[PDB]
Amino acid sequence: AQNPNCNIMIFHPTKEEFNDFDKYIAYMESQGAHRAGLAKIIPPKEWKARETYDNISEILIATPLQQVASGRAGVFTQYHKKKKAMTVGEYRHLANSKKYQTPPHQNFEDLERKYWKNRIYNSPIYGADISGSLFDENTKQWNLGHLGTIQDLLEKECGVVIEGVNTPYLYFGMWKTTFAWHTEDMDLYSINYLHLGEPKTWYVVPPEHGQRLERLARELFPGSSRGCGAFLRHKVALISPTVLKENGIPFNRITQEAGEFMVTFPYGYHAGFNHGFNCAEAINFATPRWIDYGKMASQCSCGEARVTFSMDAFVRILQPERYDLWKRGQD
């Protein structure tokens, strides 16, 4: 068995290997990358996403989200308070202000210490989930707006034609902006490209151990767990590495820098934080190996998780027994 300790693997494809996206994902899995739940892909030196980032300031962040924490430093939830619209230029200035800017630090480990010590005492503002792309249309390799769609994959594997679309999302971050512990919708893959700015630190639980994380989360968030049998689908709970280690939960960590891709694999729980002002692009995708995970994915039916239009078909076709209850949660 390749990668039996479930370590995060880092790949350096050549320009030739960067042509065929599906083939390279399958290659990474042949080497055991998926066992970690997360892999890093460093693009060949010849590649670029676009020519420059000098002209992005006029993008609008219609609904910036202030991430307000509750709990203790290592075990907390966050809720998202909606703020007034602002441009990317306005948000960048905000991120760099004395109130929000990255503190002085020695290295990524010092910054990580500071994040876990102090996160709850601040409420950073995240420009998340903005439909759009920063890839140049002429970038032909690993262009996250030109991937094969999940609807087409389902149709290729299973023969059923379904409605729905699959487009990327932009994320503008600042120091302490946080992504809560989650797997993707329908336990899909994700791919995330850090276009510019400061790093993103990731934490990940191997897919084979995801239920250990779920059991800890039910212990640590007992009211949330009584409310919903899949409350991590709400994407609000944080647990620190120290708490994970104290509870014996297998996990790994890695820092993504600008110009690097990360892939999350089906049922790979992940969480993390941004180091300072940055911009990432991410999208979900599928492969043949996903189908079995999609069929088994948990679902939130309590009403909290509320998701895209395109998840309807995935539930309807892969999980017809669950469909009626899940759709009630949608309405």
Ligand X SMILES: O=C(O)CNC(=O)C(=O)O
Q: List residues binding Ni ion (CB under 5 A).
A: 190
Which residue, 56 or 282, is less far from Mg ion as judged by CB?
56
Return the sign of the alpha-carbon dihedral for residues 143, 126, 70, 257: positive
Instruction: Based on the shown chain and the rule CB under 5 A, indicate whether residue 302 belongs to the binding site for Zn ion.
Output: yes
Give contact residues for ligand X (rule: CB under 6 A).
171, 179, 190, 192, 200, 264, 270, 280, 282
Q: Where are the beta strands (DSSP E) in 153-310?
A: 169-173, 178-182, 189-197, 200-205, 237-239, 252-256, 261-264, 269-274, 278-285
With CB cut-offs between 5 and 8 Å by kind, which of ligand X, Mg ion, Zn ion, none does residue 58 bind?
A: Mg ion
Return the sign of the alpha-carbon dihedral for residues 116, 122, 127, 129: positive
DSSP assignments along 18-34, one per residue: TS-HHHHHHHHHHTTGG
Which residue, 153 or 282, is less far from Ni ion as judged by CB?
282
User: CB 323 → Zn ion: shortest distance, Å?
Assistant: 16
Which residue, 58 or 321, is less far from Mg ion as judged by CB?
58
User: CB 198 → Mg ion: shortest distance, Å?
Assistant: 20
Q: Please list the residues that pair with 192 across neighbouring strands.
A: 262, 282
Which residue, 92 or 260, is less far from Ni ion as judged by CB?
260
- Total number of residues shown for the chain: 331
Task: For residue 264, give the amino acid letter.
Answer: T
Instruction: Spell out the residues 6+ positions from residue 232 whose beta carbon is closer than 8 angstroms to its own.
Output: 180, 181, 182, 183, 214, 217, 269
Of residues 99-138, those binding Zn ion (CB under 5 A)? none
Look up residue 213 and give its two tokens: 């994380």
Which residue in 231, 225, 232, 247 sits closest to 183, CA to CA?
Answer: 232
Instruction: Based on the shown chain and the rule CB under 5 A, indicate whether residue 304 belongs to the binding site for Zn ion.
Output: yes
With CB cut-offs between 5 and 8 Å by kind, which of ligand X, Mg ion, Ni ion, none does residue 115 bind?
A: none
User: CB 87 → Mg ion: shortest distance, Å?
Assistant: 8
Q: Which residues are annotated as a binding site?
A: 126, 182, 184, 192, 200, 228, 234-235, 270, 300, 302
Which residue, 6 or 263, is less far from Ni ion as judged by CB?
263
Instruction: Based on the shown chain and the rule CB under 5 A, indicate whether residue 162 belongs to the binding site for Zn ion.
Output: no
With CB cut-offs between 5 and 8 Å by kind, which of Zn ion, ligand X, Ni ion, none does residue 280 bind?
A: ligand X
Instruction: Based on the shown chain and the rule CB under 5 A, indicate whether residue 152 belongs to the binding site for Zn ion.
Output: no
Q: Which residues are annotated as a binding site for Zn(2+)?
A: 228, 234, 300, 302
Look up residue 43 and give its two tokens: 């693009």
Instruction: Based on the shown chain and the rule CB under 5 A, indicate whether residue 58 belongs to the binding site for Mg ion.
Output: yes
How many whole angstroms separate alpha carbon 261 and alpha carbon 280? 10
Q: Which residues are annotated as a binding site for 2-oxoglutarate?
A: 126, 192, 200, 235
Edge to edge, the sheet with strand 178-182 lists 178-182, 269-274, 200-205, 252-256
Among 75, 130, 153, 228, interactor with Zn ion by CB under 5 A: 228
Of residues 61-90, those binding Mg ion (CB under 5 A)? none
- Which residues of this protein are in contact with Mg ion, per CB under 5 A? 56, 58-59
- Which residues of this protein are in contact with Zn ion, per CB under 5 A? 228, 300, 302, 304
